C-alpha cells in the first residue's frame, strides 16, 4: 500500500497504541507506532520550528523541534531509507483532529534534496521554500480539509471563521513535483526539511498532531485516518 515515513509532532497521548503518556515527537516507519520517540514540551499558542535531516552516508533520520526561548527536543533513528521508500517520492505535511482538536497552521515550509554522483561537479538538486501561501497555490496538492491563503498560511485542518479548530478533521499538502531520492550513480544523497507551525487549541488537551511525511507519489489520505492516525495510516498496526 502507501509507503509512509514520517516525523510526527504528536500532541495527544494515545497510550493504547504505543504513545508515551505526554506530547512527543517520533519517527514513524510505515506504522503509527513510532520506532523512536522523545518527550516534547509542546506550547499551546506558540509558533514552533521543526528541522528534519538525513543523509545516505550516516543513514540516520533526525528531527529537532524548538520554540523561541526554550530548550529543543530531538529524536533520531538509524534507518536506511533506500530500503523503505521508492526511488521517486513526494513530500508533504499532514494533520488531523478527532474528538479533541487544535489548529494545525503552517506559516512556512522549506525542503532541500541533493544527490551527488561520482562525477566532477555533478549534483542533482531540488529546493522549494514557502514563506507565504496563496489561495491558489498551483505547486501544492491539497488533500482533505487543507486550504491555503488564510492570512498567507496553510491550514491543514478545518478552522471556522471565528478562528476555532474543528474536530474530526484531516488534511494534507504535498509538493507538486515528485522528488528523486535515489540514483544508481549517487555517492551521497541527503535531504533537509524545515517548517514553522502554530498549534493552538481552546482546550487543555489538544489533538492530534502534525507530521512531515515522505510517501509514494500517488499517496492519498487513508479512509478513517482522522484523529490519532494523523491522516497517514489506515489503522493502528
Amino acid at each position: 500500500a502507501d509507503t509512509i515515513v514520517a516525523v510526527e509532532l504528536d500532541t495527544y497521548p494515545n497510550t493504547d497504541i504505543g504513545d508515551p503518556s505526554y506530547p512527543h515527537i517520533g519517527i514513524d516507519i510505515k506504522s503509527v507506532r513510532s520506532k523512536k520517540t522523545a518527550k516534547w514540551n509542546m506550547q499551546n499558542g506558540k509558533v514552533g520550528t521543526a528541522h528534519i535531516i538525513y543523509n545516505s552516508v550516516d543513514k540516520r533520520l533526525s528531527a529537532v523541534v524548538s520554540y523561541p526561548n526554550a530548550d529543543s527536543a530531538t529524536v533520531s533513528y538509524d534507518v536506511d531509507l533506500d530500503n523503505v521508500l521508492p526511488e521517486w517520492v513526494r513530500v508533504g505535511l499532514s494533520a488531523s483532529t478527532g474528538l479533541y482538536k487544535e489548529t494545525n497552521t503552517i506559516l512556512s515550509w522549506s525542503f532541500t534534496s541533493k544527490l551527488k554522483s561520482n562525477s566532477t561537479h555533478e549534483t542533482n538538486a531540488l529546493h522549494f521554500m514557502f514563506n507565504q501561501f496563496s489561495k491558489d497555490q498551483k505547486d501544492l496538492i491539497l488533500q482533505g480539509d487543507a486550504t491555503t491563503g488564510t492570512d498567507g498560511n496553510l491550514e491543514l485542518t478545518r478552522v471556522s471563521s471565528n478562528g476555532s479548530p474543528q474536530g474530526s478533521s484531516v488534511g494534507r499538502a504535498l509538493f507538486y513535483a515528485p522528488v528523486h531520492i535515489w540514483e544508481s550513480s549517487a555517492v551521497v544523497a541527503s535531504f533537509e526539511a524545515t517548517f514553522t507551525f502554530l498549534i493552538k487549541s481552546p482546550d487543555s488537551h489538544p489533538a492530534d498532531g502534525i507530521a512531515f511525511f515522505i510517501s509514494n507519489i500517488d499517496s492519498s489520505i487513508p479512509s478513517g485516518s482522522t484523529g490519532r492516525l494523523l491522516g497517514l495510516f489506515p489503522d493502528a498496526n
Binding site: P13, T15, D19, P20, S21, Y22
Partner: peptide, 6 residues
C-alpha cells in the same frame, strides 16, 4: 508503557 497523558 506510560499512562499519565500530559
Amino acid at each position: 508503557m506510560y499512562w499519565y497523558p500530559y
